[PDB]
């Protein structure tokens, strides 16, 4: 349905002190289902990159950033992830999708499917919608061909939940057991 990851902007700093008054107020983008998961992955990069810790820090605001109107776009998502086999591989991939979240949350599902990495080992380096001529991969390069058309073959048509009808009389729609 809608993506499972909200897109947060988290802004925070170290609490001011006589050693460091006016800290430097870092900004950060996360894709996380909650704002506590966004607020947690913020203080992860703060102690990992900046040495500041959550008990010594302040959070200035956690608000989400809303997504642009829906159009088909080509997003460029560059992701890393941790394995212990390979020790931090880094990836850049494209995704057809209508929103940043809808692309990034789709990238978590592919890393989890193809590479079996689960959201905590993953960190998204960047995401942007890119113009059309920069799509390298012939698999996503095919969807912006104009006059693109395909039929729907090998479908599975589930009737309305009210109509399920376990035993349906043959070559007719009449339901003998519903």
């Amino acid at each position: 349905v809608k993506p499972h990851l909200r897109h947060y902007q988290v802004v925070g700093r170290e609490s001011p002190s006589e050693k460091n008054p006016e800290p430097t107020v870092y900004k950060f983008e996360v894709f996380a289902p909650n704002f506590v998961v966004a607020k947690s992955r913020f203080w992860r990069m703060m102690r990992v990159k900046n040495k500041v810790k959550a008990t010594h820090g302040d959070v200035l605001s956690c608000k989400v950033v809303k997504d642009a109107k829906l159009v088909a776009r080509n997003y460029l998502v560059d992701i890393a992830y941790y394995s212990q086999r390979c020790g931090y591989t880094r990836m850049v991939k494209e995704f057809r999708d209508v929103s940043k979240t809808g692309a990034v949350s789709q990238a978590y599902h592919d890393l989890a499917s193809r590479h079996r990495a689960r959201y905590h080992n993953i960190e998204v380096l960047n995401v942007k919608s890119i113009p059309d001529h920069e799509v390298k991969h012939l698999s996503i390069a095919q969807y912006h061909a104009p006059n693109l058309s395909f039929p729907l073959l090998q479908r599975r048509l589930k009737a309305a939940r009210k109509d399920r009808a376990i035993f349906v009389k043959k070559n007719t729609k009449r339901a003998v057991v519903a």
Binding site: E22, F42, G87, Y88, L125
Partner: protein, 158 residues
Amino acid sequence: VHSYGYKSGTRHLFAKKFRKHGAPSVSTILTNIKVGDYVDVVADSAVREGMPHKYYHGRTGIVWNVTPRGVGVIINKPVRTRTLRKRICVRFEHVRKSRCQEAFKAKEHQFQAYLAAKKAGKALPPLKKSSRMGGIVRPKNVEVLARRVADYEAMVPY
């Protein structure tokens, strides 16, 4: 500990620190100990006779007997269901007046000196407020957190 001797477990607890070696300084001979006073029992290793047992090193108690070269200290040693209150006899080279009681006896003075200061005012210094209460922040510089492509080649050295 194989032999369960008197000073059986210690090549370290009883060793002097690196480049702190020496016999006990004057300042610890010119300290005087009044009965009732709190004390640290820390055994100096450069005086043979009079050491406390291995257990008492690092404890604190109330001095009670005071003898010309000795002291005595009341230390709480927890035993099976209860705390016995042990009386040990030490040569005072191993004894240092504890600062444990201090910040409290300073809270008591800074109350009374506070109180005589209100008696006829002169007013009083202002009451410091919380750092956790509200506020608007006016950032002088703002930066971006991100994980950099370059951050990974730093974590694989070499």
